[PDB]
Amino acid sequence: GSSGSSGTRVKLNYLDQIAKFWEIQGSSLKIPNVERKILDLYSLSKIVIEEGGYEAICKDRRWARVAQRLHYPPGKNIGSLLRSHYERIIYPYEMFQSGA
């Protein structure tokens, strides 16, 4: 019949999800500014999960590729930044939203 195309549908679910969790704790959900541009915590997390989880990509120091995926500047200490922001904000959001 008819078809569509992926857009900013789910990309929002991530924000509403991580938010609904933070807004509750007390501290509003804030996004860090990397590369003179807003960070898409949605893409980073998404990719990882796909790659093969956090422990996997982490063990294979794939962080490098995970960063370049978002068209990041190859040369700057980004890998570290990402891994951090994740375990910094995406740490509780995940561990909490893990296991139904």
Side-chain angles (χ1 to χ4, degrees), residues 25-98:
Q25 297 311 275
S27 186
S28 53
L29 164 76
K30 194 162 198 292
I31 296 89
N33 311 102
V34 174
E35 292 329 303
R36 66 189 89 158
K37 199 187 278 89
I38 179 89
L39 200 162
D40 194 12
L41 65 160
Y42 158 82
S43 203
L44 166 70
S45 75
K46 277 288 150 203
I47 301 164
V48 168
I49 299 164
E50 279 194 37
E51 279 207 341
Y54 161 100
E55 293 157 285
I57 71 90
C58 281
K59 178 190 285 186
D60 274 37
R61 280 275 273 282
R62 292 272 287 186
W63 285 120
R65 303 276 162 171
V66 182
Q68 286 284 275
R69 273 279 274 160
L70 199 70
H71 303 267
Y72 270 135
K76 280 82 195 196
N77 69 326
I78 297 178
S80 305
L81 197 160
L82 311 169
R83 205 180 152 164
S84 303
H85 273 336
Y86 184 115
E87 289 198 286
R88 210 78 89 63
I89 300 162
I90 313 182
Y91 147 42
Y93 162 68
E94 278 275 51
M95 72 82 132
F96 183 104
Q97 282 276 28
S98 199

